[PDB]
Amino acid sequence: QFEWNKLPVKAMLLTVPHPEDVPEFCRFIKEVLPKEGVNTLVLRIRYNYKFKSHPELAGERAISEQQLKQIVQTCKEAKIRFIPKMNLLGHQSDRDHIDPLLAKYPQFDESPDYNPPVPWKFDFYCKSLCPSHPDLLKTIFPLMDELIDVCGADAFHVGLDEVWILGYEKCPRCGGRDKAALFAEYATKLHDHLKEKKCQMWMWSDRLIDGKTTNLLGWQASMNATFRAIDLIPTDIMICDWKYESAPPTPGYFAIKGFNVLPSSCSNSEVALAQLAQVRLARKDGTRAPWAVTLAERMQGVFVTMWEDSKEFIDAYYGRNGKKLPSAETFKAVFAQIRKEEVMN
């Protein structure tokens, strides 16, 4: 009965629309998506929400309960389980723009003398939070728990991607501690909380792979010794191993380690089938006998990810103006092959 052939998750990431794209945006969730076979939508919300908890953290072009709830509804209308996502350690700036929290609470900064280049050019990348400070879980559990509740979520994706500034030497609190521990420890507190709200935590993979010994490098995987953390965190967080370059052995790794894991992909689609072959290859294995269903059972599915605007994207899926974006088109063949995998059966 181990339906290896039936991919249980098939997730898509979309950014939260601007306020003036939400209905059309709600139409694709409704239209393209369920017929493509999207049954799991991760909305990259960040601070672009009118929070009641703390209204000041309202990202610039941010959206209201109405709007969110209306985006959710239309996902439930579609049997698409919805996942809020917000980046909760680094990516706490973006180029020279300082995402809301560190702007109005600049103390939760981990490097307050190491700031993005104005103008903007191993080189400075993003701020992170300071995961030790005592005035942050007080501030950040709110933002989270507001969305869980508006959305009605059973899972919440924290980001946990590309964290460069961590154990930065001058932080009076973090400066000098294992970098694999302060990362494993923050992750548990964001696991421990989300789990009281009966959610399944999701994270990105990179901080848990060795780009040195792997040489995968310092964006797709850790170049500052974050990687031991992979043994000191709970084994029921959902693991978003993203590779936008290649079809590498990293999925199995996490399986072996006690985790359900979703290869996460982007624009380039060569790589996407590669890594569609791979889950289908590996889920098969669970047939050879009983005991190796564990290892198969944990290759939950795949996760298609984009990063630009959902509008610029949605008017390119279709084909508006001669519109063209590989990620938009990577959705294709992929959720195309998906279908055709589990047709001829």
Side-chain angles (χ1 to χ4, degrees), residues 201-219:
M201 173 159 160
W202 288 44
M203 51 182 332
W204 294 116
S205 65
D206 31 293
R207 274 308 85 165
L208 309 147
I209 318 149
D210 195 6
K212 252 292 173 173
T213 289
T214 61
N215 204 53
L216 285 188
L217 298 194
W219 327 69

Side-chain angles (χ1 to χ4, degrees), residues 5-13 32-42 78-81 83 202 238 261-264 276 279-280 283 299-305 331 334-342:
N5 56 312
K6 299 285 186 285
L7 275 184
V9 196
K10 316 164 280 165
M12 182 204 229
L13 183 168
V32 185
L33 273 204
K35 295 171 202 140
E36 290 300 356
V38 152
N39 75 49
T40 321
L41 185 46
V42 179
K79 293 88 195 188
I80 303 163
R81 178 203 188 197
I83 301 205
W202 288 44
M238 164 80 73
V261 34
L262 297 187
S264 303
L276 203 86
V279 156
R280 300 291 193 176
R283 285 172 83 47
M299 277 268 226
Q300 284 291 247
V302 303
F303 194 161
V304 160
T305 65
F331 194 43
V334 172
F335 273 102
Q337 186 78 85
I338 295 176
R339 302 188 283 278
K340 168 157 167 299
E341 279 150 18
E342 316 177 9

Side-chain angles (χ1 to χ4, degrees), residues 174-211:
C174 287
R177 294 169 80 189
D178 178 346
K179 281 192 191 183
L182 265 176
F183 184 74
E185 216 184 337
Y186 188 62
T188 297
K189 284 162 205 193
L190 292 185
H191 177 256
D192 299 344
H193 183 64
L194 286 173
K195 165 165 174 148
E196 315 194 347
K197 311 282 296 170
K198 263 176 199 145
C199 295
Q200 186 225 9
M201 173 159 160
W202 288 44
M203 51 182 332
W204 294 116
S205 65
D206 31 293
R207 274 308 85 165
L208 309 147
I209 318 149
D210 195 6

